[PDB]
Symmetry: C3
Subunit: 261 residues, 3 copies
Amino acid sequence: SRIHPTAIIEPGAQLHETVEVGPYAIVGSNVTIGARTTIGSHSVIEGHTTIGEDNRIGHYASVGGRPQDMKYKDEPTRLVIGDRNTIREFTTIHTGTVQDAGVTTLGDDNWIMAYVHIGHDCRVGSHVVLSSNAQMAGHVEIGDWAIVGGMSGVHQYVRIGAHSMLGGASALVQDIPPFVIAAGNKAEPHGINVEGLRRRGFSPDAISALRSAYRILYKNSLSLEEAKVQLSELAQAGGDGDAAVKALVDFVESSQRGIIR
Amino acid sequence: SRIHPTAIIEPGAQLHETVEVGPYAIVGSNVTIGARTTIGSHSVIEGHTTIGEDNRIGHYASVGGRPQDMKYKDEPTRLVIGDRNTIREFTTIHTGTVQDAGVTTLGDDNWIMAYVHIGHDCRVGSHVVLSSNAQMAGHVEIGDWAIVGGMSGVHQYVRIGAHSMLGGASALVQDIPPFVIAAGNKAEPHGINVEGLRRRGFSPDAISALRSAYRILYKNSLSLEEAKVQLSELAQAGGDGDAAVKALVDFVESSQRGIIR
Amino acid sequence: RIHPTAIIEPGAQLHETVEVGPYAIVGSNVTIGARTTIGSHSVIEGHTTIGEDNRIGHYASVGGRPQDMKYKDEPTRLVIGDRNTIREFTTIHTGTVQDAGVTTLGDDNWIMAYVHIGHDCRVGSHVVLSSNAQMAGHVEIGDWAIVGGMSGVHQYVRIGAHSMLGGASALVQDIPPFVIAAGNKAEPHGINVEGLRRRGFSPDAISALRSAYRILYKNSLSLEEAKVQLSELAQAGGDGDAAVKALVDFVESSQRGIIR
């Protein structure tokens, strides 16, 4: 049996014929699951939840549970998950709220370790690593390739930029710009994520441009507005780093909570 | 049917006819559950445990497990939970120890989020919010309406005053006085919980008296002895704030671990 | 003894006296020795060997695969000894072929709820891991060590025997044996005197260790100077000499360095 005889697939659940479901797991009536996804023993998949293909969901995974927001009134809010995600034990990923945009999202190729909590209305990209017991409150955005260290907590509405890194045992209450390492309680910036950018194929010129960008943003007493002018010009320098610097200034121009400093 | 056929209700458990119990849940022989309480799938309710009415206990909730105290020798100690509590996933609430009063207590209208841990002999009031992965070691008192932020740890024997707030990712090793906001590792005081109090119906004059009390206690260079005298006088001003200030000074005077500074 | 709803995969080797509660699962490569009990909903898997007189609670994930992205399904191992208490929502993982292929726990350990023991950890005996203490890969924990609740331990850190880590601490370097540490990040705060007394260390041995602590941390010595002076104390033939030797051998073998 691809579906264990002790699993409960509630009428209405839509599972591709190739989906495997382990013992004592439950799949709710409003769940849709794509090809080759596996669900481990004791997991509960619920909510108005769409899961993609080739996902490896472990034991005791709570996927699609309702928001922990006291304003939630049982609205059929949504959770959408892409492909090739690894989701480990004692994880929680919640659906959205009608006060925001009604949907929590997770992309592709993510690595979600044990005890990780993804609150209502989060938007997580692709190739993200969420280490053990990393916990995000509502409406957190996490860009592609970001790494969140273990036993870290992230405040509601915070944005974590693409290719950024949050050290373990950190408390993050403002935005991490893309490409930046942050750490501490509360978390502060500590340079460009050089090791990460090297492993991902960024050139020494692109990395060197981002080091300049970091200096401009943090180490010259520039106001955020003054920094944006300088960063915008650096983004047009004609170098390997142009696109990366443009992503940085687009992220800082759009910050709600402001950025860590 | 209200009790899922795969749920195990041990002979001797006393459930009101309207209690619902989901798949693969277990309810122990010494458990009592009152009207309209729902127990989610995979949950284990055990110990000498009394649960009230209209409680919403989610999946994978461990309610009434034995103390994690090396002195515990399988005594039939108790856990008492009131009415209208919401208890989410991967939660742990333990019975008491015979070295204290043999009981852990939770009142009514509490919001207990995922990964929350309530150790032996805790005394939790009503309208309390315990955010995700807030963990309380043994013998912690939590006053009505208090809020504890996510990923926060509270040392054994700490008291959390009514209407106080502890920020996320904080470590609390001394008492938080009622009406006070605190944050950090270790946690320090950061003023009166002004907006909380206003939303709960505290008058402008009551809040102003509490702001004055906060300065007396923390900002005016007074010894603890001098602050207690001045607080005792402020509590007799004849204003709306009198009862709140009295509660504050009565709390300060009863502290055994001391108050946060 | 085995609840009818428990799933014991063919191949699992359980002593006749092992008890297994409702809805628990024991994998085909697991061995479990005499008088060990497994609570409801627990999943015991991997190439896992568990000893005698263990008390494993509900929702215990024991023998799960490494969270290392390099893991490719190799038959790596977890070994647990005797008389361990392992509480709820715990995770203990097997090893990786990039280290020595095995995660190990000794005897008489107290493993509280939400504790995480990552791949390739090596945990001794009489260790207390308090609620939600989490250890990344390749963490070594010496005998009698106590790790406080909601603390995180970086990969490859070594916790010395008889040490203590306070709650809500973040440990990124080694704790020498016999030392108290606390904070985010964790810093040293003296010899664990109360611990040593309870465990039978003599007053002379404790005084030697306090002297050793000052040499290492309080006397403005370089590491190289401190090591020579600790070695000279270890050679002086007093009660406590073996303990001081253990300290300097630990400091000399540190890869990540010691907390300061």
